[PDB]
Amino acid sequence: AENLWVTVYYGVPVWKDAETTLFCASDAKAYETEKHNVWATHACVPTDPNPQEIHLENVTEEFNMWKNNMVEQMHTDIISLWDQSLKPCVKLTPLCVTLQCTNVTNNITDDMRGELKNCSFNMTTELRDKKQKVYSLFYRLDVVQINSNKEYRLINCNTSACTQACPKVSFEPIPIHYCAPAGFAILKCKDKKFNGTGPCPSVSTVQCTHGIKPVVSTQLLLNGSLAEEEVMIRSENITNNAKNILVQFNTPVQINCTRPNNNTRKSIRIGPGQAFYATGDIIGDIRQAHCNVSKATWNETLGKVVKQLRKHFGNNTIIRFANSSGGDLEVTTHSFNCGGEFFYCNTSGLFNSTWISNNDSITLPCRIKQIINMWQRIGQCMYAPPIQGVIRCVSNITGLILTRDGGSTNSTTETFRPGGGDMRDNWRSELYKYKVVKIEPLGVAPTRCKRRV
Amino acid sequence: KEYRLINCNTSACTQACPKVSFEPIPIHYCAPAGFAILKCKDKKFNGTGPCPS
Amino acid sequence: INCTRPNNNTRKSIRIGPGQAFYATGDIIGDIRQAHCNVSKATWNETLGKVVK
Amino acid sequence: QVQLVQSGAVIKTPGSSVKISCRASGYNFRDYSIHWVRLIPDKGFEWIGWIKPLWGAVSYARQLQGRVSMTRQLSQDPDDPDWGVAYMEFSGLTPADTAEYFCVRRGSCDYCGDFPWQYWCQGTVVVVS
Amino acid sequence: AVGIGAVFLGFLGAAGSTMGAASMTLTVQARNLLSGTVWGIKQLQARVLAVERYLRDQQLLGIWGCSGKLICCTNVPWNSSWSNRNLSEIWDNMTWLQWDKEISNYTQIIYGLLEESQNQQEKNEQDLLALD
Amino acid sequence: AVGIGAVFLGFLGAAGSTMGAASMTLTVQARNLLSGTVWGIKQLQARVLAVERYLRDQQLLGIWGCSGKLICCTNVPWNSSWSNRNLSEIWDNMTWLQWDKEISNYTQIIYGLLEESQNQQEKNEQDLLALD
Amino acid sequence: EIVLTQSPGILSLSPGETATLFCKASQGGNAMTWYQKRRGQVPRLLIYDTSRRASGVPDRFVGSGSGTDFFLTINKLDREDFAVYYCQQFEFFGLGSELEVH
């Protein structure tokens, strides 16, 4: 009776916390169009479907979004994949050359400036002895003045030769389902009210995560995952200011964005099999690209998020907003890709408010760069191919990324500002529900049986 | 009467190295461990339908 | 064994193209001298005396 | 090693603008924040602001806005990527602004927080006529 | 619907209960432990890490008495200096997550004792067959 | 210091002695037999060659009578045409390296006989349970 | 906002006499650090976040505390160990203490 022996049980449900690599798995609709249509047509497997998302009881694991892994390796994976869709494409060594630019044919004022420059320049042919003369159009943010005449050059041609993206491939988002291999498990906090930190009371295991699309956006993350019922804010430590504040609200705000200009692409042969898609002529009215949001829904959602912000900050507090304080281009404004072309669209018009302790729309003008320098790499650029026609796209604004000014000296106003910074804070808004655990079977337990001879 | 090569408007060309040859060689395919390869040893057999040996 | 070059160099970057840097030798400041090495006389005369034995 | 070299001390007339360049070397400059802090005599320390050089995202203290500006400059070469320069421009001078200024970096350990500094520039004396 | 009883039979679904769920679920976690151009290298090394992990556990059972029984039993008496607990309370109250921490202070004491007991018993069995 | 007796229990420490050292050390050599950008490919194929080699040996014990006992015993009589030696002189005068060469002129006669004896024993055992 | 107050403030002890400073926060839930500024030299963090001392720091400085109440115990001090001490919450700075050689 009290002569207890021991038995080792194999396969015991128990785990620890660990860090492993994962494995992407995308749906077959990206495999309908084939042969390097977009990325993850050869990098991810087609999905084993319908994951075994079952429930679990009487259980509590502490979570963390901040020192969580699988967000680090995703920020490695997306960059590492992003490089692999460029090496089959053209390099622009023969194009960093003296330009002869002039203004586009347009009624120009003396003060306000056109954003298009009609530039002619020498170029090689397919042959080597002969050479050709050709012209294209460029925005104000890709030429600088080298120093009568007024000759320019491209901006990145003193640091890195540029890679044209192939116009065959596209940059549209696609769902990625991460999966854990055999010998691991992925938990999911199914609780409603959970600020991403501290113990979740109702976890549930899963085989593979649900749809996680990748977007690129600094302020005002787009097409995101909606909050469940309320409006939630999340942070690491709110009285610290050096960490951002993730706001995930409930109802999406529809945003329309467009370029009303009608373009033309113009193929220029550089050498054997080298095709440079420049911008041709502009048919119609030279007009400025812009975006619209709805007035009343935005004024409503700010009234929601102020009601949610006042919990952590005292009830009687004046709360205001401001434009971003400065820096480089794509952290003051907000950036996004809309059908294969990048915008940089001013957001002074959304954050001009103050909030007391008691048919129209908002237009906001954009700019269009053609070369990008995403993730701020030392040897990288990407000339975007100019796309045809009048362009527009419709999206859902889902959350914000904010930053408190942490000033000293007796503040009653707590002014807030948008800010992009790292790209990883976009990602942490999507993987806050999960963690990854490692199964360790072969437990051990005292009981009452004796093994015979 | 000046010419050009035929493929220069489509693709730059690769000279083969004169060291390597293109002569045929026997290749024996093999199945890995956990499979098998059957061979119809019949004489009069049109390649379609069941082989009896 | 001590080994040295007593000359004093300067490197000079030459941009060949985009992202290219040929680090050439700039000017030589001081006395144009020859690189050389020193070893000790007695230790070498000893260590040959060991290996002959 | 981690080295932070500032510029030299300077006499400035009242109402001018002063530039102070903190140059960092010995680490990957694109990763860590650069904070600016001041020591006024007989006041204790006083925080000024911070910058992240990856995109130049800045943030200021409250009681100095409209007067301070921060820029940065990276190293763009595959040979020597380590060194970085952070410029502070400080305008609207008063004779109370005579103090000594410091550029600092976050402590390098992973468990170290965001504010506790490890490395310090040698300090720059600013004196107003 | 699928009902409540399916998640009792689901993978890791038994983990919230006491031992009584673990007395019937042990085939499932044993089952799902095994079955799983630059990317293929990383998934290949993930797969071989998985099976190299599994075969260590089958080896570590092989050097004990339990070959593949999945519920073995052995012949070391339980020293009450570790547990200091009653019988049914660790068979009706504690969960296996809760059971993990109380035996996490000390490990390979038990495993060394099991190796010593099996290494002794095989020698005594060879001595039993030696006069046979 | 660490002493002399520690290397008796080290990896391959019993190789220099007779069988009496190797009669107890057998868990250690069994243990260390398993646990271990183009360089990743070469070490990956080394790792899978290692575990394939291990699993061939577990298979070759599986087709014999002893699954995971690690001290087998079986039922072919020792033909004295090979040994021609007294009993304890191959238990106290020889080493396993010395035992290797005296059974290296002939091999797989024994491995041929063990498969046949185990298959015959399984046949007679199937008949014994078939009448049962 | 958050107010910091060192204690006792200006102290006066001979070399060899071990001591302890104590600086009080206005409200809790946070964890302070400390600084050691010599005569006209570069300030120097000697202990971060509660009890973790930095690089190049001897273990004779031991800091502790909880609530709104944080201690810094200095033991086996030198005439060169003493300088002016500060304590920091996130960006806020106390006015400092000083331990005069008697």
Place this chain on the structure above:
Amino acid sequence: GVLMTQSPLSLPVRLGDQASISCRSSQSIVYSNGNTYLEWYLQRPGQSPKLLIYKVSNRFSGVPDRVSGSGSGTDFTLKISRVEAEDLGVYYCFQGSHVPYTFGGGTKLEI
């Protein structure tokens, strides 16, 4: 939760006409083998609520040839071809994906 959003809620429906009661879920209700398990609930006042259909399009034995389900992913609409007085009262959606399941908000058929 995976709570169901019902549209429309109150339907005064005349006798003989059609009726459409849709639900929209937060996630897909795709059970992990492919076969979703939806349920539509009858309810009269004074009665225990009972089943019409237990799938997207597979009904209870005893329900007449007038009630049908349709939809895919999140949008799932019930369709009654001819509405009688037996059909009046509160209707519901239901899940088969994973516990805890969510009943809806109730969709009342009236006259």
